């Protein structure tokens, strides 16, 4: 399990975690292209945990391994696990960010939307509006941390913002090289990174951009035709892009596929 100090965080230290995360859920085995990839959804352990740390406390976050869905997290309410779990969250999210919690879910426990994008924006508004960075990360960790989460007005609100920020900064920089970048260059500035269509069109398309790189017989840098409707950083088509490109700049890990050329 990994953990990640976000106080006390730097450029490196972010892309450090990053590289120990990737590590922690890539195949052992499997290569694509010279790029790694995640590992099945059958191979144990079923998470990885990503403790993200600050001043006042940790947060606990429940990842995973086979496809890096946040299932949940936990926190410290009353001095006692605090897990806070989506309405579609795994069974087992629960007890995994409180080891050994039969207890039965209640308001302080249920986060009032789906693990998705569009279940965390119902209540922390378009992401395209919240910026990715050490500072809006951190804002937000206090904002909630260890606090009522009965509060819809000011809890709920901050809460998904927590989600968006953090899923985006954990899961999808660790897929994305574009997008650990990109929160580098903003690391500490107020503002963060915003993301852009690029970001946006990546973190929709995960499988799918890593399955038209598998389906390449060609070895060396090439070509590679890229699902439909993916945009660039300016809000226009992206519809190519050269192998070089997507392993040194776009992907940092693809999803699990079987891969002709290693």
Same mark, same amino acid.
């Given at each position: 399990?990994?953990?990640?100090?976000?106080?006390?965080a730097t450029?490196?230290?972010?892309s450090?975690f990053?590289?120990?995360?990737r590590?922690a859920?890539?195949?052992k085995?499997?290569?694509?292209?010279?790029?790694?990839?995640?590992?099945?959804?059958?191979?144990?352990?079923?998470?990885?945990?990503?403790?993200?740390?600050?001043?006042?406390?940790?947060?606990?976050l429940?990842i995973?391994r086979?496809?890096?869905?946040?299932?949940?997290y936990? +926190?410290?309410y009353?001095?006692?696990?605090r897990?806070?779990?989506?309405?579609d969250?795994?069974?087992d999210a629960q007890?995994?960010?409180?080891?050994?919690?039969?207890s039965?879910p209640?308001?302080?426990?249920?986060?009032?939307y789906?693990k998705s994008?569009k279940?965390?924006?119902?209540?922390?508004?378009?992401?395209?509006?919240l910026?990715?960075?050490?500072?809006?990360?951190?804002?937000?960790m206090?904002?909630?941390?260890?606090?009522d989460?009965?509060?819809?007005?000011?809890?709920?609100?901050?809460?998904?913002?927590?989600?968006?920020?953090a899923?985006?900064?954990?899961?999808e920089?660790?897929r994305?090289?574009?997008?650990?970048?990109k929160?580098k260059a903003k690391? +500490?500035?107020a503002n963060?990174y915003?993301?852009?269509?690029?970001?946006?069109?990546?973190?929709?398309?995960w499988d799918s951009?890593?399955?038209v790189i598998?389906?390449?017989?060609?070895?060396? +840098?090439?070509?590679?035709?890229?699902?439909?409707?993916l945009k660039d950083?300016?809000?226009?088509?992206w519809?190519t892009?050269?192998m070089? +490109?997507?392993?040194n700049?776009?992907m940092?890990?693809?999803?699990?596929v079987?891969?002709?050329?290693?």
């Open positions: 399990n990994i953990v990640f100090d976000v106080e006390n450029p490196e230290t972010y450090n990053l590289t120990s995360l590590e859920v890539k195949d085995k499997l290569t694509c292209h010279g790029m790694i990839m995640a590992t099945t959804l059958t191979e144990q352990p079923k998470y990885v945990l990503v403790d993200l740390k600050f001043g006042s406390g940790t947060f606990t429940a995973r086979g496809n890096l869905y946040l299932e949940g936990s +926190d410290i009353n001095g006692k696990c897990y806070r779990i989506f309405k969250s795994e069974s007890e995994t960010v409180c080891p050994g919690d039969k039965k209640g308001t302080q426990n249920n986060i009032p789906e994008y279940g965390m924006e119902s209540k922390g508004g378009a992401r395209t509006k910026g990715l960075g050490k500072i809006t990360l951190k804002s937000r206090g904002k909630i941390y260890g606090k989460a009965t509060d819809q007005k000011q809890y709920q609100k901050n809460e998904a913002e927590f989600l968006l920020i899923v985006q900064m954990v899961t920089a660790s994305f090289k574009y997008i650990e970048n929160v690391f +500490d500035d963060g915003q993301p852009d269509p690029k970001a946006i069109s990546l973190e929709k398309n951009v890593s399955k598998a389906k390449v017989g060609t070895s060396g +840098d090439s070509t590679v035709t890229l699902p439909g409707d950083e300016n809000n226009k088509p519809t892009a050269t070089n +490109d997507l392993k700049d776009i940092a890990l693809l999803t699990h079987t891969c002709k050329v290693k």
